[PDB]
Each structure stands twice: as C-alpha cells, then as structure tokens.
C-alpha cells in the first residue's frame, strides 16, 4: 500500500515536497550510501510529520507507513531508509501506547496460542514525535564516536589487520587505537568501485602512524597467513545476519575462514534491516561496465558480457564479531536486537 493510492502524486507533492524530491534523488542515486540515505530520510519524515495532520493515531501510522513505502521502493537496496521508517513507526506506537497508560481512573509468542481475543485517540503528538526523530538524527551523528572507543579491546600493538575498501567507521576504529598503539593495517583496494576511497583512506591511516600496506584484491589470500584479524565495514546487515557489503569482501571472508582468521564487522545498528535475503539476485546491484572495461574497446565490449557488481554478500556464519554503537555482539544476538528496535509488523513496508 504505497502513497499513490492514498492520494494523487500531484499532491504528495504540494503536501509532501520533501518526499517526491527524495524519491527522485534516491532513484537517480544522488543521495546514496547508508548514512546519507538515513539522515535525509529522517529529515524528510520530520517535515512530513510537521505538515501532515492525522487526528486519530491510525491516520499518522497509515500515512508514515505509506509514505515510507514509496521511499523504500525508490531505491530498495538502501535499507537504511526503511530502517529509519520502522524506527519512527515504533516511536509513534510506543509513545502513544505510553500515552494510553497515561490516562488513569504478549511477553511470549509461544504462550499466546492459548491467549484470548481508542479512548481519546489523539493528534498533536507532533512535539514528541519530532523530538524522537531529531533524537534519531543525533544518534546517527554519534555512531563513530562510541564505536571507535571499543578498538582498545581488539586492536593491540604489532598486530596485523586486514581491511578492504573504504569505511569511515572502520577508519575511525583504527585511528582511535592508533593514537596510543602502533600496529599494521593491510588495505585491500575495493577495485573497481571502492578504489579511490580506499587509496585515500590508506594515506590517512599512514598519516595516523599506522604501518599501512596497499594491496590488489588478488593478493588477499597470499598475505592472509600473517594476518591476525579481519575488520570490515558493511553497507547493510539483513534479517538472517547476512552482510550486504561492497564487492570483493567475499574474497576476504573466504580467505579468512580458510586461514582460521577472525572476521570482525564495524557497523552502526541503523544498517540492521529485518528483510530476509530470499533471492540474492535482487540484492546485488550492478553498476556500469565502464568501471571494469573501457568504452573505447569497441570490439571487446561488442563481443563480450561485462559485469560490474558493486555489492557482495557474506553469509552470517563468516562473521565472528559485530562491533556496533550498542557494543560488541555475536551474529546470533542480532535476532533480539531487531526485536528491540523494530515492531514486527513493519518488516514488509
């Protein structure tokens, strides 16, 4: 149930100009990446709540759910968008539900099977809804700050760390331990898509006083034998605990398992999406052949299939530890983390 049915698009425009604008920038992929998408989605939702007027609570919920739905289908593999939507939806229900308690005078799912089969429903919840939304936007700005501090428990002197591509979270993680401890980091370029980003990050790691080595993706297996830990960033973490990450990460994860090297993942909880990876064919996106084969190679591109995926998938069993802003947890416990941050109904948006 998208927003087209509820209202004409022409006035999902004058009533919600931020939504139609975000949908456009999401499809064209001008606003891309987990963090950027998350922030912009939250901001758009803020002016949606700011301008929507929904007097029983169910009009709000239906509005945000429908508006969030079209934001999801604009660019379905940017799961951070849908996650923000699910947060705000639980923000309303719980807050309102708490409001319901305010007027005066489950706990198992299994037990329910034998279970048994409003007053002043209200608007002007805006103040608290906008509050919690602004909070979320803030809590997004603190992810690196309270993640990097956990590096003193996993990064030690003279250890060798393998990482791939560019991750601002991982970079922060490394540099925070780098101030007091001197170690080594091998940066595998994320060719062809995370190439420049990783090359740039590698320079800064070196400037931070870290013994940085830059290797091609083919060299990953060759140096795995002298690597203590693998530290990876991720684009998204799905419902089963699997990783939607940037291409080439499978090389690292597989080579790590083979050499019995631990795989650590640093990621904010906002990248944790409840959607189940039914078909990986829909999850992996493909960019232009341009990044791999040059266009002036007329004969080659005419006689060959050139494929450039910029997403890789890691099964949840190849991740030993998740470093999050909520702390360090095994892939197993991600199950309960989702149950605490999302309402189960919002799994399909």
């Amino acid at each position: 149930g998208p927003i087209s049915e509820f209202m004409s698009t022409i006035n999902v425009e004058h009533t919600y100009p931020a939504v139609s604008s975000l949908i456009a920038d999401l499809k064209s992929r001008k606003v891309q990446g987990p963090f950027a998408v998350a922030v912009e989605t939250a901001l758009v939702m803020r002016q949606v709540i700011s301008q929507t007027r929904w007097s029983t609570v169910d009009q709000l919920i239906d509005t945000v759910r429908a508006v969030g739905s079209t934001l999801v289908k604009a660019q379905p593999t940017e799961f951070s968008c849908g996650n923000i939507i699910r947060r705000i939806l639980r923000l309303i229900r719980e807050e309102y539900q708490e409001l319901l308690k305010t007027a005066d005078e489950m706990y198992s799912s299994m037990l329910n099977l034998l279970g048994r089969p409003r007053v002043t429903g209200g608007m002007d919840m805006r103040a608290v809804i906008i509050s919690g939304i602004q909070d979320v936007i803030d809590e997004l700005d603190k992810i690196n700050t309270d993640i990097e501090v956990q590096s003193m428990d996993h990064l030690h002197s003279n250890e060798i760390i393998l990482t791939q591509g560019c991750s601002k979270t991982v970079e922060a993680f490394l540099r925070f331990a780098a101030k007091k401890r001197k170690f080594s980091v091998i940066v595998a370029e994320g060719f062809p898509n995370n190439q420049k980003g990783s090359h740039a990050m590698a320079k800064r790691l070196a400037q931070a006083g870290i013994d940085t080595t830059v290797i091609s993706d083919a060299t990953i297996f060759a140096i795995m034998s002298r690597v203590n830990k693998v530290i990876l960033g991720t684009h998204a973490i799905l419902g089963n605990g699997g990783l939607v990450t940037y291409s080439g990460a499978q090389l690292v994860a597989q080579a790590a398992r083979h050499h019995a090297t631990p795989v650590v993942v640093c990621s904010g909880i906002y990248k944790l999406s409840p959607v189940y990876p039914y078909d990986l064919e829909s999850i992996i996106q493909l960019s232009s052949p341009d990044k791999i084969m040059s266009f002036n190679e007329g004969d080659l591109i005419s006689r060959a299939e050139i494929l450039n995926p910029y997403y890789d998938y890691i099964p949840p069993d190849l991740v030993d530890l998740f470093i999050t802003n909520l702390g360090g947890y095994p892939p197993s416990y991600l199950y309960r983390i989702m149950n605490d941050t999302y309402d189960a109904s919002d799994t399909i948006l």
């Binding site: 299994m110 037990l111 099977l113 034998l114 189940y276």
Partner: protein
C-alpha cells in the same frame, strides 16, 4: 475418560492437526470433565492427565511440547490471581479457536516459505510433511516454475504420498531412494524438510532420514531449511544425534551359536529383498539434526536462523 485415545481421537479425525496441538486439545477435554476441588489439585489432575498421556504414546516428544505449553499457560494464569475456573472457562470455550490458530500458523509459515523458491529451481524433500507441501503448493499458486525431488522414507514410505500431493498440484516430481540422496545434490538448489519438534538449541527432531539430507546438503553447500510451528518448540536438550527416548529397544544383534537353519549384479532391482517388519522395528523411527546443519527455521514467528532464537522463545515461555 481415556486421554490417550482422545489424543489419538484428535489425530485421525483431523489430518491437518499437529501432535502438540492435539495434546493441548486432549488436555482441554480433560479440564471440561475435571470438577476440581481446590487449586492445588486443579494442577495435579492436569499433571496426572498430562503424564499418563505421555506414557501412552510411543514417540512423545511432539505432544510433550504441547503439554509443556499448556501447563505453563495454566500455571502462569493461576499464579497471578488464580481463579482456576475462569481458567477452565477460558480454555473450554476458546478450544477450537486454538485449532484454527494452529492452522493460521502453517498458513503464515507457507507465506514466508514460498519466496524461498525461485524461478527454475530444484527442491529436495524427505518424506511427507504438512507445511513443506503448504510452502510448495503456495509457490505453485503463484505460478512459479520449479521441480521437486522426493525421497521414499523407509519404513514409513511417506515419500509416495508426498509426490502424489505435489503432482496433484501439477508440479513435476522425481522420487529418489534413501541411498541415492547424496548423488542428486548437484541437481538440487534447495533442501526443505519438516519437523516433529524443535529442541532448545534449534535442532530438529523428525523422521529417520532427515539428518542424512542435512549432511549431504552442507557437503554440497546447498541451503537446508526446516518448517516447524512455534508450538513444536520443546524445552529439552539432546547431547547428540542419538540422545532421545526410544519407544522400543533398537539396534541390537542376534546371538547365533548354533547351525543354520539353511552375488547381486548391482544392476538388479530386487524390491522383494527389503527388510521385514520385525527387524525394521529394530531400527530408529526418529532422527536428530544439530542446528549448524540448519540454514533457517521457517516458523509462524518468521524465519529463524539464530538458533539461539528458539532458545529465546523457550526462555520467554518459562518466565
């Protein structure tokens, strides 16, 4: 009032009812004829009936999962304020509601299951299981192109009923002998089985050949999904694939001191040369599948991979 043949009396009457649910219903039938005198004994007649039901059925793991859920429900509702007769009142009225709720479970399981099957895939199944079919049939209703390998399940031979069901839905099927399962894995895209019960560590208690498929799958790097209702979750922990209560003594040898009384071309098909019923009773009926062989558990509560998640549900259940 015989609860055992009543628990039985729920199974042949309803083909789509599950053993834990049937056990729950059998306990409801007990509380309607209870006429309990005090609370202390509203619980022990519930206790006595639950126990004697467990003793009267040979494979009791599934129904015990229901018995567990039931007494825990009663205990939790009686602890709070303990009007044991409202409790009785509650169960008896909403009794058939529990049965339809269970049917709603399998339906939700099917809706979560069919997206796992994609265009032009091949599915392997061990024996017959309601829910496994429900997922497959639901995938067919969406006109998804897929084919299904089915294993004959000695001794029950449930594979024949399963493949009949599947081609009654006009889906292509090919039966495979229990010994030929692993050979077919290179053609298999997904393995899908059902469960009689799910133990604490998220392991599977099902008919004899399941764990075999689970190993062949992991060896062939093929995903292995199971289909189980949340009320099949039981609090018990087998320390191995061999640690479950046996109804009748199995896997024992003869003692041949005295005389008598008294090559296959390997291309020869001798269906007359199968084991007789006596020595088949000497074989295990059930099978335990450790959670590291299970990709995901398709339940009414969603698809569970965690294998601490089944434990999490059991925890919330018992406090």
């Amino acid at each position: 009032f015989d609860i055992v043949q009543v628990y039985k009396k729920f199974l042949q009457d309803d083909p789509e009812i599950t053993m834990p649910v049937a056990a729950i219903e059998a306990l409801v039938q007990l509380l309607s004829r209870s006429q309990a005198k005090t609370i202390s004994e509203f619980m022990d007649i519930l206790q006595n009936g639950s126990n004697t039901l467990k003793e009267g059925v040979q494979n009791n793991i599934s129904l015990s999962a229901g018995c567990d859920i039931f007494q825990r429900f009663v205990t939790r509702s009686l602890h709070d304020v303990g009007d044991f007769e409202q409790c009785k009142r509650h169960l008896v009225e909403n009794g058939k509601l529990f049965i339809q709720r269970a049917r709603a479970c399998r339906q939700r399981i099917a809706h979560l299951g069919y997206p796992l099957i994609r265009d032009g895939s091949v599915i392997l199944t061990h024996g017959f299981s309601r829910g496994v079919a429900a997922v497959l049939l639901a995938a067919a209703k969406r006109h998804v192109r897929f084919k299904v390998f089915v294993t004959e399940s000695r001794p029950s031979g449930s594979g024949c009923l399963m493949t009949r069901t599947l081609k009654n839905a006009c889906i292509p099927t090919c039966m495979v002998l229990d010994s030929a399962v692993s050979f077919t894995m290179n053609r298999v895209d997904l393995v899908l089985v059902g469960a009689e019960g799910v133990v604490e560590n998220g392991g599977l208690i099902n008919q004899i050949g399941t764990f075999q498929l689970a190993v062949f799958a992991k060896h062939a790097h093929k995903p292995f999904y199971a289909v189980a209702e949340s009320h099949k979750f039981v609090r018990m922990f087998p320390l191995s694939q061999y640690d479950i209560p046996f109804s009748r003594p199995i896997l024992e040898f003869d003692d041949p001191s005295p005389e008598t009384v008294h090559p296959t071309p390997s291309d020869a098909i001798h269906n007359e040369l199968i084991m007789n019923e006596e020595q088949i009773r000497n074989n295990p009926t059930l099978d335990v599948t450790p959670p590291e062989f299970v990709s995901g558990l398709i339940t009414d509560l969603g698809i569970i991979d965690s294998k601490s998640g089944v434990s999490e549900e059991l925890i919330k259940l018992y406090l």
